């Protein structure tokens, strides 16, 4: 019989959502070389992933609209382009299906989609194929979408530090950690926020939900709770397969620089590429780093150099590196790095915990607040920066706590324990090995 298995894949076609889904598809394509995988992105998302990159023969890339009509210039805010893409609806997605079917000469048998592309469920239902939702965000935030009314009520009535005890396994989460998007009502609501708020109804319709994380690190009650809500909950190890990686020149000599430093002595600072930090916090970060005296590597966008204190880079040049880019995977795996100062983006956190690096957290956006809370109060492998925003005195205190003080020993010890848990999780007997096989059979059975 001719193999006619054909998986269509819809990323959420924006930055941090792209590599984790390609990573998963690469793994699936390698184990099932007789199966077609059709990756459907926008021109900009395809450029982002596939420019420098060779892909296996059974992965083909197709392009659909980004929802930005020619001539339009989106405002400088991180939600507009998301709304515009989501507004293109299932018909834009079906144009992708058409291209994939025409090239492969095979009807689609299964869809894998980033959970945020909820229109792809309608597409799957129209084709009568299974819909597999992919979750590359903070694993724990899944629970929020099944409890929106309780969360809104508590956030409106209760104290800011009140705990969300109604979420099994997640009683450490607080009102103040909740994504603002899920609370906004009226004019503040966006197509993006409305889409996220529909996840409680959308996700149980998925044949399986695939979580890009380590099941062994999530609270067991949370995992049980999610299993009770979904048809199938599968964890696939988020670590990069070799084909995802693109060999890169360490232009700034980060690793060599780190080689000259003592074990667990260096602060690696990176606060993301999606929301601009308030300039006053950028200044605060610089002042604290300089005053702390600790060695540091700060990955900072070029456009922010002009707001750093005059002479800061020059005065710290003998103990710090302020650079536009670092090979973060390699930096976080370097033994010299003793703390990761982070906005708590999901992939950053994944890399930090898998390498045993404790964190100082300043969540800015989305579910970063959930991640920060899990890091501090559940895993206990870090702290939310003293003050909840970067200040010179507060950040200096957090740096000392984690890097040098005996009071930070528990956190340092916990980071090593969590690293060992991850190492055993990605092993041949971890849950994920079985869950990956389960996913493969869903695709082969479709
Ligand atoms: O996980 C999330 C995520 O990735 C993004 C995002 C925003 C802009 C981008 O360009 C790319 C992603 O927003 C979010 C907003 C939330 O309220 C909750 C979340 O969990 C996310």
35 annotated ligand-binding residue: no
Residues with CB under 6 A from ligand 1: 14-17, 78, 82, 137, 141, 179, 181, 196, 274, 366-367
Domain 249-424: CATH class, spelled out: alpha beta
Tokens read off for 285: 């970060």
**Which ligand 1 atom is nearest residue 274's CA?**
10
* 302 assigned to a ligand binding site: no
- Ligand 1 centre to CA of 78 (Å) is 9
Mutate to test the pocket of ligand 1, among 203, 367, 370, 371 (most ligand atoms within 8 A of CB): 367
Count of CB atoms situated within 10 Å of the CB of 443: 20
The domains spanning 1-248+425-444 and 249-424 adopt the same CATH topology: yes
Q: How were these coordinates obtained?
A: X-ray
Query: Burial letters for 245-279: b for 16+ Cβ neighbours within 10 Å, e otherwise?
Result: eeeeeeebebeebbeebeebbbbbbbbbeeebbee
Query: How many angstroms is it from 367 CA to the middle of ligand 1?
Result: 7
Residues annotated as catalytic are 17, 114
Q: What share of the chain is helix, strand, coil (3-state, %, to 5)?
A: 50, 15, 40
The encoded tokens of residue 426 equal 């990605």
Q: Could you please report the per-residue DSSP string of 380-412?
A: -SEEEPTTSS--HHHHHHHHHHHHT-GGGHHHH
Q: Whose CA is nearest to atom 16 of ligand 1?
A: 366
The Cα diameter of the chain in Å comes to 70
Domain coordinates in residue numbering, the chain: 1-248+425-444, 249-424
Among 122, 54, 48, 57, which Cα is nearest to 90's? 122
Cα separation, 175 vs 242, whole angstroms:
40
What is the stated resolution of the deposited model, in angstroms? 1.8
The Å distance, Cα 275 to ligand 1 centre, comes to 11
CA of 287 from ligand 1 middle (Å) equals 30
Interhelix angle 392-403/279-292, nearest 10 degrees: 50
Contact call for residues 119 and 90 (beta carbons, < 8 A): yes
Neighbouring CB atoms inside 10 A of 50's CB total 16
3-class DSSP state for residue 80?
helix
Atom 8 in ligand 1: which residue has the minimum CA distance? 78
Q: What b/e string do you get for 322-358 counting C-beta neighbours within 10 Å, with b at 16 or more? A: bbeebbbbebbebbbbbbbbbbbbbbbbbbbbbbbbb
Task: Give the pair of three-digit tokens for residue 151.
Answer: 């969360």
Helix (H), strand (E) at residue 191: helix 191-197
Mapping DSSP onto H, E and C, the string for the chain reads CCCCCEEEEECCCCHHHHHHHHHHHHHHHHHCCCCEEEEEEEHHHHHHHHCCCCCCCCEEEEEECCCCCCCCCCCCCCCHHHHHHHCCHHHHHHHHHHHHHHHHCCCCCEEEEECCCCHHHHHHHHHCCCEEEEECCCHHHHHHHHCHHHHHHHHHHCCCCCECCCCCCCCCCEHHHCCHHHCCCHHHCCHHHHHHHCHHHHHHHCCEEEECCCHHHCCHHHHHHHHHHCCCEEECCCCCCCCCCCCCCCCCCHHHHHHCCCCCCEEEEECCCCCCCCHHHHHHHHHHHHHHCCCEEEECCHHHHHHCCCCHHHHCCCCEEEECCCCHHHHHCCCCEEEEEECCCHHHHHHHHHCCCCEEECCCCCCHHHHHHHHHHHCCCEEECCCCCCCHHHHHHHHHHHHCCHHHHHHHHHHHHHHHHHHHHCCCCCHHHHHHHHHHHHHHHC
Is 273 annotated as belonging to a binding site?
yes
Q: Whose CA is nearest to atom 4 of ligand 1?
A: 137
Query: How is domain 1-248+425-444 classified at the CATH fold level?
Result: Rossmann fold (3.40.50)
Task: Kindly state the tokens that stand for 86.
Answer: 């989501």
- 273 near 15, Cβ under 8 Å? yes
Answer yes or no: is 187 a known binding residue. no
């Amino acid at each position: 019989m001719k193999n006619k298995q054909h998986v269509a894949i819809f990323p959420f076609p924006f930055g941090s959502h792209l590599p984790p889904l390609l990573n998963l598809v690469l793994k699936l394509a390698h184990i099932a070389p007789n199966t077609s995988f059709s990756f459907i992105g926008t021109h900009s998302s395809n450029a982002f992933l596939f420019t420098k990159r060779h892909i296996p023969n059974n992965i083909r890339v197709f392009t659909i609209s980004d929802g930005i009509p020619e001539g339009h210039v989106p405002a400088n805010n991180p939600i507009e382009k998301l709304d515009l893409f989501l507004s293109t609806g299932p018909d834009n997605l079906r144009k992708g299906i058409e291209l994939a079917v025409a090239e492969t000469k095979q009807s689609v048998t299964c869809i894998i989609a980033d959970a945020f592309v909820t229109s792809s469920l309608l597409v799957a239902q129209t084709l009568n194929v299974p819909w597999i939702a992919f979750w590359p965000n903070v694993s724990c935030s899944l629970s929020l979408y099944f409890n929106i009314d309780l969360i809104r009520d508590k956030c409106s009535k209760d104290a800011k530090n009140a705990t969300l005890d109604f979420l099994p396994g997640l009683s450490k989460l607080r009102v103040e950690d909740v994504p603002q998007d899920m609370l906004d009502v009226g004019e503040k609501e966006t197509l993006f926020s409305r889409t996220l708020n529909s996840l409680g109804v959308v996700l149980p319709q998925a044949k399986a939900v695939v979580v890009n994380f380590f099941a062994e690190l999530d609270p067991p009650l949370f995992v049980k709770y999610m299993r009770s809500k979904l048809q199938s909950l599968l964890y696939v190890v988020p670590l990069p397969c070799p084909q995802l990686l693109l060999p890169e020149i360490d232009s700034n000599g980060c690793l060599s620089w780190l080689d000259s430093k003592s074990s667990r002595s260096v602060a690696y600072v990176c606060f993301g590429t999606v929301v601009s930090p308030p300039p006053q916090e950028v200044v605060a970060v610089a002042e604290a780093l300089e005053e702390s005296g600790f060695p540091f590597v700060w990955a900072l966008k070029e456009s922010l150099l002009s707001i750093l204190p005059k002479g800061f880079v020059e005065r710290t040049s003998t103990r710090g590196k302020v650079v536009s880019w670092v090979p973060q995977s390699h930096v976080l795996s370097h033994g010299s790095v003793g703390v990761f100062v982070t906005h708590c983006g999901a992939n950053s956190v994944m890399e930090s915990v898998s390498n045993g690096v404790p964190m100082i957290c300043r969540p800015f956006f989305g579910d970063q607040g959930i991640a920060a809370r899990v890091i501090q109060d559940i895993w206990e492998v870090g702290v939310i920066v003293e003050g909840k925003v970067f200040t010179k005195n507060g950040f200096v205190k957090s740096l000392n706590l984690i890097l040098v003080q005996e009071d930070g020993k528990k956190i340092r010890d916990n980071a090593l324990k969590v690293k060992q848990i991850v190492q055993d999780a990605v092993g041949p007997h971890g849950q994920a090995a079985e869950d990956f096989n389960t996913l493969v059979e869903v695709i082969s059975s479709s």
